[PDB]
């Protein structure tokens, strides 16, 4: 339909902008954006937490600490460790 948009678009009438695939830039901070409310220490590595999630989606960032928290939930801990986050790094990426 993007090419079918060109059927609707011999220039008339719209603006064409591309939606990007995710990259490590957002992966750092958009997780840090989701990391505001959660309980976590400042000893977490941003390098591996970002780069362990190539491709996937923006909805990947949602599932990062949720399912990681789900086991920490199940574990009852207050603030988590990156291992449990590393566990869900696999978990949400196990499916694909």
């Amino acid at each position: 339909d993007i090419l079918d948009s060109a059927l609707l678009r011999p220039g008339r009438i719209d603006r064409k902008i591309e939606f990007p695939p995710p990259n490590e830039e957002a992966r750092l901070d958009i997780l840090k954006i989701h990391s505001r409310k959660m309980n976590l220490t400042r000893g977490i590595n941003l390098r591996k937490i970002a780069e362990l999630m190539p491709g996937a989606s923006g909805a990947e960032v949602k599932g990062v600490c949720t399912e990681a928290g789900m086991y920490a939930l199940r574990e009852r801990r207050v603030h988590v460790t990156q291992e449990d986050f590393e566990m869900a790094v696999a978990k949400v990426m196990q499916k694909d």
């Binding site: 959660m38 309980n39 976590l40 220490t41 400042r42 000893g43 977490i44 590595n45 009852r76 801990r77 207050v78 603030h79 988590v80």
Partner: protein
């Protein structure tokens, strides 16, 4: 990191009330003084117990070498904050300064407790802080600060759930209920 100093506080009770022990209580006090490198505790013990003879350069060079171990940490905090790693910095200075405050009084203790209060995201380290207020409140038999740390910790623990450390708090509050007079809550907890 408690029982060595917990026995020191027990030795304070062994020196204080009975006046008939002049030998074993001061002996093992020095045996526990030559370790952990205490400074302010042996000052209060110096006024209550014997004044020696001489300490001076012995514990002053031990507080000088421990100051080098104190100044290697306190000059590493600006070198550690040069990098960035959330906790990969302040957790070292919160626990070891409480070990540097274990050298004396309440100062490094209380200032590290409210220091790290805004950092740790896990209740385990917050309850470890609670353990530090409970041991330092047990040495000085001060019941004022042992209620507040536990009142703030239980809300995070009972949010919530635990097995071991919940039984640990039951022993704490049991020791406080038996510190003052409570007959039922001691055995019930």
């Amino acid at each position: 990191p408690k029982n060595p100093d917990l026995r020191i506080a027990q030795l304070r009770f062994l020196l204080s009330l009975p006046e008939h022990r002049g030998d074993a209580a001061v002996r093992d006090e020095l045996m526990a003084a030559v370790r952990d490198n205490n400074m302010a505790p042996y000052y209060e013990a110096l006024c209550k117990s014997l004044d020696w003879q001489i300490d001076v350069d012995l514990l002053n060079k031990m507080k000088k070498a421990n100051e080098d171990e104190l100044k290697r940490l306190d000059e590493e905090l600006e070198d550690a904050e040069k990098n960035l790693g959330e906790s990969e910095i302040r957790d070292a200075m919160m626990a070891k300064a409480e070990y540097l405050c274990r050298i004396g009084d309440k100062e490094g203790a209380l200032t590290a407790f409210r220091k790290t209060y805004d950092k740790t995201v896990a209740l385990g380290h917050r309850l470890d802080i609670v353990f530090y207020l409970l041991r330092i409140g047990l040495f000085y038999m001060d019941n004022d600060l042992i209620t507040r740390n536990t009142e703030k910790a239980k809300s995070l623990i009972e949010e919530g759930g635990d097995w071991d450390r919940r039984n640990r708090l039951k022993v704490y509050q049991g020791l406080y209920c038996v510190a003052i007079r409570d007959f039922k809550q001691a055995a019930e907890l």
